[PDB]
Amino acid sequence: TQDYAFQPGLTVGELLKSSQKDWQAAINHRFVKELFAGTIENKVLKDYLIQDYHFFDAFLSMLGACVAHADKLESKLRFAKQLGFLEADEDGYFQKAFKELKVAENDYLEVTLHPVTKAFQDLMYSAVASSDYAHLLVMLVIAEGLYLDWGSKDLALPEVYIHSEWINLHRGPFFAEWVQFLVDELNRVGKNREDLTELQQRWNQAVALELAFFDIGYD
Amino acid sequence: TQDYAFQPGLTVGELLKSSQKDWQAAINHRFVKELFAGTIENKVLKDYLIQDYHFFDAFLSMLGACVAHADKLESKLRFAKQLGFLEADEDGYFQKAFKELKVAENDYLEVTLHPVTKAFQDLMYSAVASSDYAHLLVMLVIAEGLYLDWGSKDLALPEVYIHSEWINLHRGPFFAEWVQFLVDELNRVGKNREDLTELQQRWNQAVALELAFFDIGYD
Is A100 annotated in some ligand binding site? no
Neighbours of A74 (CB within 10 A): 8
Distance of residue B178 Cα from the nearest chain A Cα, in angstroms? 15
**8 A C-beta contact, residue A182 and residue A145:** yes
Question: Using the beta-carbon criterion (under 8 Å), do B77 and A63 form an inter-chain contact?
Answer: no
- The chain B residue lying nearest A128, using CA atoms, is B68
| Chain A residues within 8 A of B87 when measuring between CB atoms | 77-78, 80-81, 84
> What is the C-alpha separation between A68 and A64, in angstroms, rounded?
6
N-term to C-term CA, chain B: 34
Q: How many residues does chain A have?
A: 219
Question: Using the beta-carbon criterion (under 8 Å), do B64 and A85 form an inter-chain contact?
Answer: no
Which residues of B participate in the annotated binding site for substrate? 52, 90, 144
Write out the residues of chain B at the interface with chain A, using a CB-CB cutoff of 8 A. 57, 60-69, 73, 76-81, 83-88, 91, 128
Question: Using the beta-carbon criterion (under 8 Å), do A84 and B83 form an inter-chain contact?
Answer: yes
Q: What is the SS3 string spanning chain A?
A: CCCCCCCCHHHHHHHHHCCHHHHHHHHCCHHHHHHHHCCCCHHHHHHHHHHHHHHHHHHHHHHHHHHHHCCCHHHHHHHHHHHHHHHHHHHHHHHHHHHHCCCCHHHHHCCCCCHHHHHHHHHHHHHHHHCCHHHHHHHHHHHHHHHHHHHCCCCCCCCCHHHHHHHHCCCCHHHHHHHHHHHHHHHHHHCCCCCHHHHHHHHHHHHHHHHHHHCHHHC
> What is the C-alpha separation between A135 and A195, in angstroms, rounded?
10
Question: Using the beta-carbon criterion (under 8 Å), do B68 and A77 form an inter-chain contact?
Answer: no
Tally A–B CB contacts below 8 A.
92
Per-residue b/e over B49-81, b at no fewer than 16 CB within 10 Å? bbbbbbbbebbbbbbbbbbbbbeebebbbbbbb
Breaks in chain B (C to N over 2.5 Å), named by the residue before each, are none
Q: In CATH, what number is assigned to the domain containing residue A30? A: 1.20.910.10
Q: Does the annotation mark A105 as catalytic?
A: no
How many degrees, rounded to 5, is the angle at CA A41 between CA A37 and CA A45? 95
Q: How many residues does chain B have?
A: 219
Q: Which of B53, B59, B61, B67 to mutate to test the interface with A (most CBs of A within 10 A)?
A: B67
Cα-flanking dihedrals φ and ψ of residue A6, to 5°?
Answer: -120, 170
Sorted by sequence, the CB contacts under 8 Å of residue A80 that are 6+ apart come out as A67, B60, B63, B64, B83, B84, B86, B87
How many degrees, rounded to 5, is the angle at CA B130 between CA B126 and CA B133? 110
**What radius of gyration, in Å, describes the C-alpha atoms of chain B?**
17
> What is the C-alpha separation between B219 and B215, in angstroms, rounded?
6
- Tell which residue, A217, A216, A22, A21, has the closest CA to residue A119: A216
Sorted by sequence, the CB contacts under 8 Å of residue A146 that are 6+ apart come out as A23, A26, A27, A207, A210
- The residue segments making up the domain with residue A87 are 1-219
* Number of compact structural domains in chain A: 1
Question: Using the beta-carbon criterion (under 8 Å), do A61 and B84 form an inter-chain contact?
Answer: no
Q: Which pairs with CB-CB distance under 8 Å and at least 24 residues apart come from A1-5?
A: A4/A145, A4/A149, A5/A145, A5/A148, A5/A149, A5/A151, A5/A152, A5/A176, A5/A179
Experimentally determined by:
X-ray
> What is the C-alpha separation between B87 and A82, in angstroms, rounded?
10
